[PDB]
Design a protein around this ligand. Structure first.
Ligand SMILES: [Zn+2]
Lengths: 49, 207, 98, 82, 47, 49, 193, 42, 222, 96, 49, 302
């Protein structure tokens, strides 16, 4: 429901929040694209380079 | 190697130049001193043979302002008090109201305050070589600076209903301020050549 | 991005806006709507497949989620209201169930 | 303070771009609040444009004060401005 | 007697006559309120 | 090779080597090799965050 | 939905995709007079950064202006009258009684007006009661070599408020200096511009 | 699309409760040099 | 394309902060509202770009000049304004020797209809002599409809008639005229360029800049 | 890099016309105030000169003739913020 | 620059006045010559940063 | 300002001649004299120090007499001057008029202040209640009058608060009210504990509980005004919130009579006029006085 990975150890993962998306079915392409997308993490988004 | 000679020579076409740019008067020969002209004037066995004779003066072309000025070149680095207080009574006996000193390098601060008091009606002023060697007035980015009489200053403050603190200021440590020899409060009329619409005359003061 | 007519023609930023916006289209989000407990869904009533298509639009079974229709487009500076990217809609074709 | 004498007035004799604006503003205000009009109407209804017809002939009261930043001020009749 | 007056609690008083009416945005009034809440207050005069 | 190393382990350097080693149940943890300026290598790792 | 003209797009720089706006109305009379005279849209023609005007016509207007202005054009009496009125529509503006035209450039074997005569005509229709007609020569945007080697159009030239030669374009009218409309702004007051 | 001729005022500061005008717009009106308009609108 | 994508305002409360007042007082001595001057005859007084676009357009002014002479309404202007004092002193100041200050400093250009810019006089007279192909003159043939003095008066007229509105709050005009074109564009195609540069030079006005370069032209004997 | 003391020495190049990437500290400190004025004028005019935008030099005139008012040149931040006479704008802009 | 100088002023089908895109380009309305060059000749080198 | 004090000298730590110098400087700067207020330093030289102070004082008197017959520069000068003055007053440790060493004081961010007694060698030549230091500063203020007057005549309470004001319910429809209730509970506990103390290691436990409640009160205030302490917005936290006053409410504020809509262009209407739907023409209305001639229009509209 939340995505926040509350663990005594980060499980060797940089970021610890926003791990889940909601399968927004507004449109079928939005659906599939939600499934197949990947992301690198806002730890680099905070970094404009 | 011996580039010191060209240095101290060039220091004059900034010193003898600093006679008018002040209002005093000097032979057009002291402004047209060639490189070898200086050597011929101040020479000797050396090839160093310049010192102990680099000292001149000038009197006003306005015939007033009480009195005249005298320039001098103290070759000894960091002249200190044992050379500074000494070269004041020369100005006094010669009735030289204002004197000009040049030192290289690092004039000691301890031997600056105690002379700054005995200035009084006189003004030791102030420069030192290696920093003022060519005429900064000879430049593209510096407009024409002209002093003003309290007559003209009164006229300016009358035309604009001002108080003498409502105008733009110039700090005293400005190179052009000391160059012009400014007292704290006198109004400079500068001539901006800002080439967007003609050249005009702005006004500044010193506090 | 593959489901794009002649996608190898337009300057790439256009294709990029194409993906990002086509993911935000008012088409059918599915078929079994009667039992959808969602917040906000969107469905368009009169749908048809394109005339121009890449084959994989038929292969991937996209026949079961049309997202637009096929319009009679005429590029012309006629009206004077369609500049700054603007566009006009035939009244008749609109009331006719566009 | 002081009022500048009429004889010596250094302010621009021109109706400034701002002065016309404020002047017409208040003249519309007066006229709209049942003030006497010093120009014949031509069937005109907007109380404001009427002041335009008034200014166009410069037949208008309500001199203006120009304040010098020092503390002085000029008093220019609208008929006297350009 | 005419000059003097009373309080909502009944405290008699007198004076404080020189009073005028001024237009100002009420948000400034709120600022004065919360600034009085700091014991810091401005003394704005009028003509 | 990343500068962020040297500013933390000052005897270290940006030169380094890592591996994100993983158990058979897919439970990866990392451990970085820090080549320090003196010459030794420090065996960094993470536990209890 | 609130409607305005294109020529304001540029100044507001809005892309006309949906970007909404705030719409204000002054209460008193002085404020509305002030907005009416100082900051009326017609008094905002030269941006403050440099003198370059930014309000003006856009893609479609410059395009068909180029097409029509080209000397190859011709108009019977019907077209000329319909077009002149279509542009004028004085009633929606007022202040004007009756429409005046010019004679046709050619008469035989048939009367025909050119678009350049048309621009001259409209320019005449707005000529202030007593303000001498406009005389001017300024380069066009389209280089002359496009029309022909040693093409004569090249640069718009026209005296006393009558279009003589050259074709109008973005440089003539629009966000451009020393075209036609900019001289209009200077001469016949802004409101006529 | 939200019109507001008038409505509720704030609890504390009597402001129309939550259209925005100011803090960049102020620069605009004072750029035109249109004081009465500014004091009017704000 | 996508690179062009990832490549794609705090100044406007900086350059607007100290530039609130900056208003054009009536004496034509532009100050902040506190009382102290910043300039005389703002930025070469004539005016901000609006009514100074055609000052350079000598030809188009001289072309018709008859719509313009009535637009300026000479018969009213010449009534209450002075013209010959500053027009006379302008010649004497145009004598290159100093002790003849610019008339704008001596005579306010709001009423004395001879007081204009210096470079303005240089340009207008230079144009008068170089290609006067439309201004006739010899002078015996001028007295039909033109005059050397006529167009000269027209130009002195346009300048005086195109002064700044005394009372323009200009500091924010410039604040806009920098802020808008600033964030207008920020992308590049070594010296630090763009808004970082303008930031260091204006916003922090700092010693120790990042790409400090000097440039000196050489002489003949090298 | 900038060392004016140094360029004083050589006479191969004319010691009058010398463009500068600003470092307006140095140019102001040892050329006078007006030098700094014209310098930042031409400087920012170039800063926009690299772009296809033209900014009439009058606004540049004003920015310049103000930034250098005191006799030095003041940055449009806490320092220049801290000297205005109106206790309201100062209350309004950065920190109440 | 060579092949562009050769093709676009004359290589294409219909000449300046009747060509509606030549118009929208050269009249300053919308586009530029670099646009007709890309669409009609070539794309050139892809300068990325 | 306390740190710069001298309890035994009853003065500041500084020399009275430097204090007098800065006094002359500020007085002559007051009337708009800057280079003259800087010329007060061209005087070179307790009795002799008093004579120099006479020299400087009389020079200010004269220069004022000449000047008699505000701007950014002046305040920019006064501010720098007082900065240097304070940097100087904060440095001296030993008295010059008292020649003694006042017992220094150590502060705390948690609103706690005091320090240890004097040193033995210094005799040769913590946290407690606020009333003592309050009277300390009151004594300094009444004693050092002229300079302080130039600085800010009455200066006693400017740093402390005997009774704070409460706003009407009109501004408090909450959190602020609760914080006031808390500080009142604090003040009633203080009054009670003080009465317990005056009516009475008894002093140990009594002073312990007393200073505990004193600090709880002072921390209650510190929390009420500022929220950064006592880990609940404080007043300063709602002003400098950057989300409240002076920008969301003073320069930019919502208004009446202003619509907000999406735009579409139109070529028919005008470059000047804007075409508006009738909805807004209804929902946007403005006042109008009625004269005799515009009467028919207004009547028709009604
Ligand atoms: Zn003591």
């Amino acid at each position: 429901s939340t995505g926040n990975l509350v663990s005594n150890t980060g499980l060797d993962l940089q970021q610890a929040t926003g791990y889940t998306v909601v399968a927004e079915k507004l449109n079928f392409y939005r659906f599939l694209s939600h499934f197949r997308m990947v992301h690198r993490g806002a730890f680099f988004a905070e970094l404009k380079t | 190697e011996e580039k010191n000679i060209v240095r101290v020579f060039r220091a004059w076409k900034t010193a003898h130049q600093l006679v008018h740019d002040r209002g005093y008067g000097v032979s057009q020969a002291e402004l047209d001193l060639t490189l070898d002209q200086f050597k011929a004037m101040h020479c000797g066995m050396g090839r160093n043979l310049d010192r102990t004779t680099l000292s001149f003066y000038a009197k006003p072309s306005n015939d007033s302002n009480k009195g005249t000025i005298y320039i001098e070149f103290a070759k000894e680095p960091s002249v200190g008090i044992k050379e500074m207080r000494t070269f004041v009574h020369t100005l006094g006996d010669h009735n030289h109201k204002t004197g000009i000193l040049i030192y290289a390098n690092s004039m000691t601060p301890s031997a600056a305050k105690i002379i700054a008091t005995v200035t009084g009606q006189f003004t030791i002023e102030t420069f030192q070589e290696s920093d003022l060697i060519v005429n900064i007035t000879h430049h593209e980015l510096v407009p024409k600076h002209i002093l003003l009489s309290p007559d003209e200053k009164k006229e300016l403050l009358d035309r604009y209903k001002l108080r003498e603190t409502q105008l733009p200021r110039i700090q005293l440590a400005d190179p052009v301020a000391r160059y012009l020899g400014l007292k704290r409060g006198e109004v400079v009329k500068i001539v901006r050549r800002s080439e967007t619409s003609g050249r005009y005359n702005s006004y500044r003061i010193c506090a | 991005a593959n489901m794009t007519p002649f996608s190898d023609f337009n300057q790439s930023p256009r294709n990029m806006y194409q993906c990002q916006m086509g993911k935000q289209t008012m088409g059918t989000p599915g078929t079994a709507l009667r039992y959808r407990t969602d917040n906000k869904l969107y469905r368009l009533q009169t749908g048809q497949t394109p005339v121009v298509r890449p084959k994989l639009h038929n292969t991937y079974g996209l026949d079961h989620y049309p997202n637009g229709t096929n319009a009679v487009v005429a590029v012309i500076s006629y009206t004077g209201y369609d500049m700054e990217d603007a566009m006009i809609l035939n009244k008749s074709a609109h009331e006719r169930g566009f | 303070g002081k009022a500048v004498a009429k004889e010596d007035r250094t302010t621009t004799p021109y109706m400034t771009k701002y002065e016309r604006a404020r002047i017409l503003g208040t003249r519309a205000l007066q006229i709209s609040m049942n003030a006497p009009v010093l120009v014949d109407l031509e069937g005109e209804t907007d109380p404001l444009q009427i002041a335009m017809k008034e200014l166009a002939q410069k037949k208008i009261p309500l001199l203006v004060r120009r304040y010098l930043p020092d503390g002085s001020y000029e008093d220019w009749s609208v008929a006297e401005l350009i | 007697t005419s000059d003097i007056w009373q309080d909502g609690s009944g405290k008699k008083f007198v004076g404080g006559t020189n009073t005028t009416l001024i237009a100002l945005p009420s948000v400034f009034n709120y600022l004065t309120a919360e600034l009085t809440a700091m014991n810091i207050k401005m003394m704005l005069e009028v003509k | 090779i990343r500068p962020s190393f040297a500013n933390r382990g000052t005897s270290y350097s940006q030169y380094g080597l890592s591996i994100r080693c993983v158990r058979p149940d897919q439970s990866s943890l990392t451990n970085t090799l820090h080549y320090l300026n003196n010459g030794v290598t420090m065996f960094r790792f993470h536990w209890r965050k | 939905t609130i409607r305005m003209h294109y020529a304001n797009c540029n100044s507001y720089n809005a892309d006309f995709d949906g970007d909404e706006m705030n719409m204000h109305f002054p209460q008193s009379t002085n404020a509305r007079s002030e907005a009416q005279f100082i900051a009326n849209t017609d008094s905002q023609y030269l941006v403050p950064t440099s003198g370059d005007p930014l309000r003006g016509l856009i893609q479609d207007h410059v395009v068909m202006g180029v097409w029509l202005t080209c000397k190859d054009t011709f108009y019977t009496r019907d077209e000329y009258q319909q077009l002149l009125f279509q542009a004028l529509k004085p009633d929606e503006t007022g202040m004007y009684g009756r429409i005046k035209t010019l004679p046709p450039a050619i008469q035989r074997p048939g009367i025909y007006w050119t678009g350049k005569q048309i621009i001259s005509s409209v320019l005449l229709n707005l000529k202030p009661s007593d303000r001498p007609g406009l005389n001017l020569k300024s380069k066009a945007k389209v280089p002359g070599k496009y029309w022909s080697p040693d093409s004569e159009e090249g640069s718009v030239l026209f005296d006393d408020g009558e279009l003589l030669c050259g074709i109008l374009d973005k440089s003539s009218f629009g966000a451009s200096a020393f075209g036609l409309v900019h001289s209009v702004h200077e001469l016949y007051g802004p409101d006529i511009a | 699309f939200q019109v507001r001729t008038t409505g509720p005022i704030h609890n504390l500061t009597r402001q129309p409760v939550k259209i925005r005008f100011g803090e960049m717009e102020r620069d605009a009106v004072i750029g035109h040099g249109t004081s009465f308009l500014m004091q009017d609108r704000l | 394309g996508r690179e062009g994508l990832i490549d794609t305002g705090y100044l406007q409360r900086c350059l607007m902060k100290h530039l609130e007042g900056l208003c054009v007082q009536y004496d034509h001595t532009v100050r902040d509202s506190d009382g102290s001057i910043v300039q005389f005859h703002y930025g070469e007084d004539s005016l901000d770009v609006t009514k100074q676009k055609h000052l350079t357009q000598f030809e188009f002014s001289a072309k018709n000049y008859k719509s313009l002479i009535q637009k300026y309404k000479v018969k009213s202007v010449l009534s209450a304004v002075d013209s010959e004092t500053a027009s006379s002193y302008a010649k004497k100041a145009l004598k290159k020797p100093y002790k003849y200050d610019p008339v704008l400093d001596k005579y306010p250009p709001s009423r004395y209809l001879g007081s204009v810019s210096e470079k303005f006089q240089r340009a207008v007279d230079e144009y008068t002599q170089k290609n006067p192909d439309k201004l006739i003159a010899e002078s015996k043939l001028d007295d039909s409809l033109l005059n050397e003095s006529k167009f000269k008066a027209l130009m002195q007229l346009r300048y005086q008639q195109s002064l700044v509105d005394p009372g323009e709050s200009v500091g924010v005009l410039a604040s806009q005229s920098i802020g808008e074109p600033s964030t207008q564009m920020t992308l590049n195609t070594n010296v630090t360029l763009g808004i970082p540069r303008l930031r260091e030079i204006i916003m922090t006005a700092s010693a120790n800049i990042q790409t400090p370069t000097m440039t000196l032209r050489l002489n003949d004997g090298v | 890099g900038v060392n004016l003391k140094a360029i004083w020495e050589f006479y191969n190049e004319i010691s009058m016309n010398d463009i500068y990437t600003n470092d307006i500290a140095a140019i102001l400190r040892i050329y006078g105030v007006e030098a700094a004025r014209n310098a930042i004028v031409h400087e920012v005019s170039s800063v926009f000169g690299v772009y296809g935008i033209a900014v009439d030099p009058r606004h540049l005139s004003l920015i310049a003739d103000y930034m250098t008012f005191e006799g030095g040149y003041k940055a449009f931040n806490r320092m220049g913020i801290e000297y205005n006479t109106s206790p309201f704008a100062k209350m309004s802009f950065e920190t109440t | 620059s060579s092949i562009i100088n050769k093709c676009i002023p004359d290589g294409l089908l219909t000449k300046f006045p009747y060509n509606h895109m030549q118009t929208m380009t050269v009249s300053g309305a919308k586009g530029s010559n670099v646009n007709v060059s890309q669409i009609s000749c070539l794309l050139g080198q892809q300068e990325l940063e | 300002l306390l740190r710069s004090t001298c309890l035994y000298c009853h003065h500041f730590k500084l020399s009275k001649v430097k204090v007098h110098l800065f006094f002359c400087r500020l007085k002559l700067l007051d009337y708009g004299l800057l280079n003259e207020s800087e010329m007060v330093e061209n005087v070179s030289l307790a009795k002799d120090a008093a004579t120099l102070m006479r020299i400087r004082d009389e020079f200010v008197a004269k220069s004022i007499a000449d000047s008699r017959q505000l701007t950014t520069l002046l305040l920019h000068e006064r501010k720098k001057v007082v900065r240097a003055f304070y940097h100087a007053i904060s440095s001296r440790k030993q008295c010059d008029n008292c020649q003694s060493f006042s017992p220094n004081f150590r502060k705390e961010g948690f609103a706690k202040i005091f320090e240890i007694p004097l040193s033995g060698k210094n005799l040769q030549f913590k946290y407690m209640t606020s009333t003592e230091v309050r009277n300390h500063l009151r004594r300094l203020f009444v004693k050092e009058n002229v300079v302080l007057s130039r600085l800010y005549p009455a200066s006693a309470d400017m740093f402390f608060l005997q009774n704070i004001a409460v706003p009407p319910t009109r501004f408090r429809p909450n959190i602020q009210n609760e914080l006031l209730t808390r500080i009142l509970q604090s003040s009633i506990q203080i009054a009670s504990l003080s009465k317990d103390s005056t009516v009475e290691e008894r002093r140990s436990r009594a002073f312990e509980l007393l200073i505990n409640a004193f600090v709880q009160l002072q921390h209650d205030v510190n929390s009420l005004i500022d929220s950064n302490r006592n880990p609940p917005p404080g007043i300063k936290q709602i002003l400098e919130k950057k989300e409240g006053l002076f920008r969301k409410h003073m320069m930019g504020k919502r208004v009446n009579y202003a619509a907000r809509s999406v735009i579409s262009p139109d070529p028919n209407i005008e470059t000047n006029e804007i075409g508006v739907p009738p909805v807004f023409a209804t929902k946007l209305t403005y006042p109008e006085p009625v004269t005799l001639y515009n009467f028919n229009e207004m009547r028709n509209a009604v």
